[PDB]
Coordinates of C-alpha atoms in Angstrom, one line a residue:
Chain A
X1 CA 14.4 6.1 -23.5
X2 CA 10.7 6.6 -24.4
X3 CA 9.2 3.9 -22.4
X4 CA 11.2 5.5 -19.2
X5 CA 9.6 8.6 -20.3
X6 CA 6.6 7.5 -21.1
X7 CA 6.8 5.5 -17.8
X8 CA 8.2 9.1 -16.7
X9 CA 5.2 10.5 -18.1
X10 CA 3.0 7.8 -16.0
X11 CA 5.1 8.9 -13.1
X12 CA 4.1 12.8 -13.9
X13 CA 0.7 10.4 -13.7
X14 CA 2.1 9.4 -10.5
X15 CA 3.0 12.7 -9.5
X16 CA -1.0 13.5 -10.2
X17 CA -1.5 10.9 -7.3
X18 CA -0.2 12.9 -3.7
X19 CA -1.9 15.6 -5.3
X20 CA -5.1 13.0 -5.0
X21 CA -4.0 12.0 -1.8
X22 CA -3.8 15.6 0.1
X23 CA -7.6 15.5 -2.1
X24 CA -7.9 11.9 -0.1
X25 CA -6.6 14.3 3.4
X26 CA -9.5 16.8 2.6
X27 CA -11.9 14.2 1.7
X28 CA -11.1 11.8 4.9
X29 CA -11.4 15.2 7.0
X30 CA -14.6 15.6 5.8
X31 CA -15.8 12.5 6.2
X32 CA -14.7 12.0 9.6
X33 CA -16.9 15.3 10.7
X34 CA -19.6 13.9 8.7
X35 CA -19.6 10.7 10.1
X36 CA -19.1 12.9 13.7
X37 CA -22.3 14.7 12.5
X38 CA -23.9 11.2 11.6
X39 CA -22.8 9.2 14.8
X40 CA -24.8 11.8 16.7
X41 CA -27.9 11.3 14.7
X42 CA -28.0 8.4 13.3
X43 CA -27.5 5.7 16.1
X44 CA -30.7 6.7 17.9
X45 CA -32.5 6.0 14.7
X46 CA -31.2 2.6 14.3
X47 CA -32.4 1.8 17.9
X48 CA -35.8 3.2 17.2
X49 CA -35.7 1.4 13.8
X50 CA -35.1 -2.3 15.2
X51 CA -37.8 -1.3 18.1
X52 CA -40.3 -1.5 14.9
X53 CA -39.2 -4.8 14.6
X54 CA -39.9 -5.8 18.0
X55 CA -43.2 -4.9 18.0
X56 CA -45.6 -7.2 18.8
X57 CA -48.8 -8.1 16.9
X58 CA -51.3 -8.0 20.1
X59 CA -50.3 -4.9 21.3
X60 CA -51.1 -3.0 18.1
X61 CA -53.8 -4.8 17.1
X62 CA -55.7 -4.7 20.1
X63 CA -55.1 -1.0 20.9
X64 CA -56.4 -0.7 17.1
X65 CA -59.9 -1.7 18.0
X66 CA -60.0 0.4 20.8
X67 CA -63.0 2.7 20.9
X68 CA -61.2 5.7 22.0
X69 CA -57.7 6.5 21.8
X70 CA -56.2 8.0 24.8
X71 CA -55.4 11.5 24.7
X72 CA -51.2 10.8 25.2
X73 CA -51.4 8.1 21.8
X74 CA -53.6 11.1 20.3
X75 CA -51.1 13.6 20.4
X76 CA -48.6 11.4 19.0
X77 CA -50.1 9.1 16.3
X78 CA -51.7 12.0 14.3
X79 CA -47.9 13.4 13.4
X80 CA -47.2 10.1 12.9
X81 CA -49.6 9.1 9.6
X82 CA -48.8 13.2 8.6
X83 CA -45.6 11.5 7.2
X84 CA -47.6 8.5 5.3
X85 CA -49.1 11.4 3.0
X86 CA -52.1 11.1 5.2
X87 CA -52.7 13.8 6.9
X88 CA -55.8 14.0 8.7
X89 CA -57.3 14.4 12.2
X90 CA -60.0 11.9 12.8
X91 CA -59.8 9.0 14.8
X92 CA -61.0 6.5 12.2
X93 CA -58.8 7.3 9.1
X94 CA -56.1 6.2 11.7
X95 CA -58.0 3.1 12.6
X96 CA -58.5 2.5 8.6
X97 CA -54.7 3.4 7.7
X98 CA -52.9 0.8 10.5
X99 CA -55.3 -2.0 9.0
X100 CA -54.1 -2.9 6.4
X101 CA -51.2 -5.8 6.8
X102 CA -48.8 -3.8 4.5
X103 CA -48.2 -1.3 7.5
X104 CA -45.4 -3.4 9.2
X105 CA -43.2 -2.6 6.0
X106 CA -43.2 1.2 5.8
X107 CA -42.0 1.5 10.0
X108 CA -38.8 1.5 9.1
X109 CA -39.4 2.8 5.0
X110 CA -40.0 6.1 6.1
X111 CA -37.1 8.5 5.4
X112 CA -36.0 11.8 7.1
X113 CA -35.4 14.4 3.7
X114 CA -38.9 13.5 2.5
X115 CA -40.3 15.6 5.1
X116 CA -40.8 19.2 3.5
X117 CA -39.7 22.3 5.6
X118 CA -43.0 23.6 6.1
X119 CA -44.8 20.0 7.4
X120 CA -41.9 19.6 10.0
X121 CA -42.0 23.8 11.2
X122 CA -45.8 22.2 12.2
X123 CA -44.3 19.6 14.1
X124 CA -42.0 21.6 16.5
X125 CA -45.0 23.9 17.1
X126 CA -47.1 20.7 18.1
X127 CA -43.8 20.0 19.9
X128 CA -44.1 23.0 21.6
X129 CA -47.8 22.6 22.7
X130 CA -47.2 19.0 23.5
X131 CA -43.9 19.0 24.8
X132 CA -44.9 16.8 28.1
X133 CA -46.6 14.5 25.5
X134 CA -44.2 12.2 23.7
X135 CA -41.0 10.2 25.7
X136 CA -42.4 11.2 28.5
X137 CA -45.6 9.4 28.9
X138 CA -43.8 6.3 26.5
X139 CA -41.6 6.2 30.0
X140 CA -44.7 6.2 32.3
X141 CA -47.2 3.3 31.1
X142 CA -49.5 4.5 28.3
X143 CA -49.4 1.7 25.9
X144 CA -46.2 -0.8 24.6
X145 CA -47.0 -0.7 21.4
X146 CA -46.5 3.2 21.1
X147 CA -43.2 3.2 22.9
X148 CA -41.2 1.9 19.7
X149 CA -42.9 4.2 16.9
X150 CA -43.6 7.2 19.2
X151 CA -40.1 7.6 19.7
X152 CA -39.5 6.8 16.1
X153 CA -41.7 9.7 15.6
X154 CA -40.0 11.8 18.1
X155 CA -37.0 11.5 15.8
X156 CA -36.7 12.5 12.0
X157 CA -37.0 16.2 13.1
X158 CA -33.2 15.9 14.9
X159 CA -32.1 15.0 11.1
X160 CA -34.0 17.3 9.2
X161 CA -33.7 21.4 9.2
X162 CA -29.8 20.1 9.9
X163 CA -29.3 17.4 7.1
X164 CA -29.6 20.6 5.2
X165 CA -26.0 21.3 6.3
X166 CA -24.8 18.3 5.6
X167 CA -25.8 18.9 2.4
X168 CA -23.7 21.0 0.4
X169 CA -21.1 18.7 2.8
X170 CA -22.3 15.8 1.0
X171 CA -22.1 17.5 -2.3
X172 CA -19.2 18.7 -2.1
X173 CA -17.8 14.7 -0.8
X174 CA -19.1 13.6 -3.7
X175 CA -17.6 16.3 -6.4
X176 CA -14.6 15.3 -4.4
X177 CA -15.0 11.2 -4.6
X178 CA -16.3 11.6 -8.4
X179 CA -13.2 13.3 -9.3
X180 CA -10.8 11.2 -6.9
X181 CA -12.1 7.8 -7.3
X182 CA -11.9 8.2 -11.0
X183 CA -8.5 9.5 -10.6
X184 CA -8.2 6.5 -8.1
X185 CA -8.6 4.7 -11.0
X186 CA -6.0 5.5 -12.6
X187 CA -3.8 5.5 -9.9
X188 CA -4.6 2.0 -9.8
X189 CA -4.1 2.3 -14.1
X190 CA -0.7 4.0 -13.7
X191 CA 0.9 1.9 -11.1
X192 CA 0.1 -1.3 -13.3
X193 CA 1.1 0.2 -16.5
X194 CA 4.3 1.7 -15.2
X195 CA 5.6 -2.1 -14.2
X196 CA 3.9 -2.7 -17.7
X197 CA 6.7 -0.4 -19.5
X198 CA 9.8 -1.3 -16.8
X199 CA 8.6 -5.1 -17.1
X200 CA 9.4 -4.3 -21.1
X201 CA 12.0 -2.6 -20.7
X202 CA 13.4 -4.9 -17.8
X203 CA 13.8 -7.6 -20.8
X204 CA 14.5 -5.4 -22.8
X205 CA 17.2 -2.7 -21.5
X206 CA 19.4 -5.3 -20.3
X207 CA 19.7 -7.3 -23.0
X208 CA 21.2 -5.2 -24.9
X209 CA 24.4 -4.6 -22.0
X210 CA 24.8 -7.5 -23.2
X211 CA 23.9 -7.2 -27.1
X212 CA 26.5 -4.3 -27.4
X213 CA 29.2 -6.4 -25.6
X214 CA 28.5 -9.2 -28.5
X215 CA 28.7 -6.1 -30.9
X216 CA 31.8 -5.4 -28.9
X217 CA 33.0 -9.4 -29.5
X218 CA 32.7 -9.1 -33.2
X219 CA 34.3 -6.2 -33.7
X220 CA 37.0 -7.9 -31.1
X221 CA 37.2 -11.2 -33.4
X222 CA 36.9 -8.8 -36.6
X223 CA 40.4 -7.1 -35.6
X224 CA 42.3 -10.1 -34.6
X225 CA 40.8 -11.3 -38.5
X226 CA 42.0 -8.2 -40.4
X227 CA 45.5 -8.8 -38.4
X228 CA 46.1 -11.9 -39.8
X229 CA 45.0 -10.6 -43.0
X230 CA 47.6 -8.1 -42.6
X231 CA 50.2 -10.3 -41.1
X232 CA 49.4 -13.4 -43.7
X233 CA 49.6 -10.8 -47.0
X234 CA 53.2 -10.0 -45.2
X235 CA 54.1 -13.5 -45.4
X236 CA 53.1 -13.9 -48.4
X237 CA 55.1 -10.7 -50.5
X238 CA 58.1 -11.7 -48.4
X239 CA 57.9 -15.5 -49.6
X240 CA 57.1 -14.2 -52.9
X241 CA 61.0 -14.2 -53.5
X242 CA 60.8 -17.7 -52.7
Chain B
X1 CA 23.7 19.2 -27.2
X2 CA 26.0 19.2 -23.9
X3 CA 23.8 16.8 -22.4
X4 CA 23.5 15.0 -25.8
X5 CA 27.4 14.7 -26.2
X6 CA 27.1 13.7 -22.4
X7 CA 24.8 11.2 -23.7
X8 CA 26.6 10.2 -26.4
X9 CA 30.5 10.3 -25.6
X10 CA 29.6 9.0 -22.0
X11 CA 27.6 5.6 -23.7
X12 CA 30.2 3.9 -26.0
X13 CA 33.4 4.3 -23.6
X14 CA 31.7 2.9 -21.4
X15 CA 30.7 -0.1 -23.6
X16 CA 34.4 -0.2 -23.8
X17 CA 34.3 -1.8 -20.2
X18 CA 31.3 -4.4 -21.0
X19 CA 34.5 -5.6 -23.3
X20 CA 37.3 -5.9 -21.0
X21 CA 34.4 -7.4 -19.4
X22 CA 34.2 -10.4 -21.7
X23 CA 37.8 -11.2 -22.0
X24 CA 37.4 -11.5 -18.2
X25 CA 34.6 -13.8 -18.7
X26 CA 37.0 -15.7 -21.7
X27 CA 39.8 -15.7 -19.4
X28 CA 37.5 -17.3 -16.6
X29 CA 35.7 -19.5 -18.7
X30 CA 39.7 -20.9 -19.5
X31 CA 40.9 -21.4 -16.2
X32 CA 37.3 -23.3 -15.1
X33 CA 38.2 -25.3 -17.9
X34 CA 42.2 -25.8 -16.3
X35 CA 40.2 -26.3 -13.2
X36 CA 38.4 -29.3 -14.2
X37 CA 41.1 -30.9 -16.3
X38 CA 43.4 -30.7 -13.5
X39 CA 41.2 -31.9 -10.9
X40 CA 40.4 -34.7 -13.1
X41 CA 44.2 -35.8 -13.5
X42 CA 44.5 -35.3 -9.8
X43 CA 41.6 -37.9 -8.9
X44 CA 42.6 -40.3 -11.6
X45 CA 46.4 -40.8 -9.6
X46 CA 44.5 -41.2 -6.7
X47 CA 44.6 -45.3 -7.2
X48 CA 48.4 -44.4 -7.9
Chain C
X1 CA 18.6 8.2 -19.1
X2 CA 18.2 10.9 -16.8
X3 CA 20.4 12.7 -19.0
X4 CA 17.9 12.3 -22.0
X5 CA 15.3 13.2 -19.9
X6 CA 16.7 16.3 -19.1
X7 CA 17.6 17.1 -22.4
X8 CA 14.0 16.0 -23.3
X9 CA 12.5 18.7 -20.4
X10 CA 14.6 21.1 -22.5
X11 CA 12.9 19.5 -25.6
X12 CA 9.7 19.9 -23.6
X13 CA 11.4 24.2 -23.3
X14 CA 11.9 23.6 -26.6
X15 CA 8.2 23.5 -27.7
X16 CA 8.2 26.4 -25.3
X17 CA 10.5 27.7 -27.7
X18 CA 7.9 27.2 -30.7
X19 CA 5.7 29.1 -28.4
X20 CA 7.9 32.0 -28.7
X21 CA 8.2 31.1 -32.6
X22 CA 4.6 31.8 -32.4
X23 CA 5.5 35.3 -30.7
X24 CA 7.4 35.6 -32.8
X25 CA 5.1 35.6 -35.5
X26 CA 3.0 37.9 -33.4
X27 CA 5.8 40.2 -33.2
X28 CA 7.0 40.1 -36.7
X29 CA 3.4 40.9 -37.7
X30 CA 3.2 43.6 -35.4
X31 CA 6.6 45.1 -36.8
X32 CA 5.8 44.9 -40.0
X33 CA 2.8 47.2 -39.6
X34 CA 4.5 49.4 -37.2
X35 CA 7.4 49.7 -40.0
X36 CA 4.5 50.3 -42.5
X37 CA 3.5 53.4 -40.7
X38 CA 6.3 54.3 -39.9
X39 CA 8.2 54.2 -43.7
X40 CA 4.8 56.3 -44.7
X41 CA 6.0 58.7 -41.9
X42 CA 9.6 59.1 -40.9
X43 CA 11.0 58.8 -44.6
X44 CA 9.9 62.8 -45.3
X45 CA 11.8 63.7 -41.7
X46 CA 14.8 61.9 -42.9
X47 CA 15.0 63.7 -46.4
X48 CA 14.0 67.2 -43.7

């Protein structure tokens, strides 16, 4: 009777579970607007961030030792190294921070909530002084080698300022994993220790249907004794005489 | 204590069927053994 | 076994029960001051 119960009591466990799957409906709802929100951001991102990849050698390095930048990569390379906490505005401290061979890792580093609220409110003012800079000029001709990271720096501001929305969404997914996955756990936990306790009792329960019917045989066998007992004592005070 | 003499009063009556249950299985077990030693007789006058 | 169950959800109302054993405890406490005041009080009106 206890191991039901307590299997009962797994199944008041169990009962614990739909509770954890309407949390599982509230937490797949929100995660299907998030990923919504994400598939709307984050795919361009992933384009711009194999385009760093695809970038060739020559047509960095030889737009490097240029003598003078033109004014379009100008506009658009100085945003650029304000993320690689180097921000500065002179020609050469760009020339001297592309040098270095350790710059084709950190294209694709670089990571949108670093940027602090204040360095990207500069940027969308520079947007808004250089908004035909940018795409536009990537489209025309000014140089291959910008076309991949301008772009790359065109985004990171369409994640940030909004990220920030996501996250107390985010925060909120993971209070609601944290407390569902660990009581996916023992969902996982009760289901296997609830056959744990019916497996027992499976051997055990009906084995004694059958223990009480040879309880039930004995007692069966000790009657038909006691009435020859009875019926052999007869005999024997009636051939007493004898 | 309803539910208990429920429990109780409603267990061992019907244990009292698990026994007619075995003098089924004792009567059975006596006529497999009638069938065997009768289909044994029946295929030894078979030459006869 | 659902029977025992059953009577083992009204074991479960039983502890309930203890609760109210608690109560009462609460209550009899409770009474027992009220009654003090009151046996320093009423007992003159009765007499009256």
């Amino acid at each position: 009777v206890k191991d039901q119960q307590e299997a009962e009591k797994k199944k008041v466990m169990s009962q614990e579970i739909q509770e954890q799957l309407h949390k599982q409906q509230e937490v797949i709802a929100d995660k299907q607007m998030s990923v919504k929100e994400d598939l709307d951001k984050v795919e361009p991102a992933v384009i711009e961030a194999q385009n760093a990849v695809k970038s060739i050698k020559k047509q960095h390095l030889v737009e490097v030792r240029s003598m003078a930048n033109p004014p379009a990569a100008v506009k658009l390379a100085l945003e650029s190294i304000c993320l690689l906490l180097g921000e500065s505005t002179t020609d050469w401290k760009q020339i001297r921070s592309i040098i270095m061979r350790e710059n084709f890792i950190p294209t694709i580093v670089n990571f949108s909530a670093e940027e602090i609220s204040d360095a990207i409110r500069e940027k969308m003012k520079k947007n808004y002084m250089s908004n035909p800079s940018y795409n536009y000029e990537i489209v025309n001709r000014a140089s291959l080698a910008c076309g991949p990271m301008v772009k790359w720096a065109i985004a990171q501001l369409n994640y940030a300022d909004m990220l920030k929305r996501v996250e107390p969404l985010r925060n909120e997914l993971q209070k609601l994993e944290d407390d569902a996955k660990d009581n996916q756990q023992k969902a996982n936990e009760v289901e296997q220790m609830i056959r744990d306790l019916e497996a027992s009792i499976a051997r055990y329960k009906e084995e004694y249907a059958v223990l009480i019917s040879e309880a039930q045989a004995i007692k069966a066998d000790l009657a038909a004794v006691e009435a020859k007992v009875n019926r052999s004592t007869a005999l024997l005070k009636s051939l007493s005489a004898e």
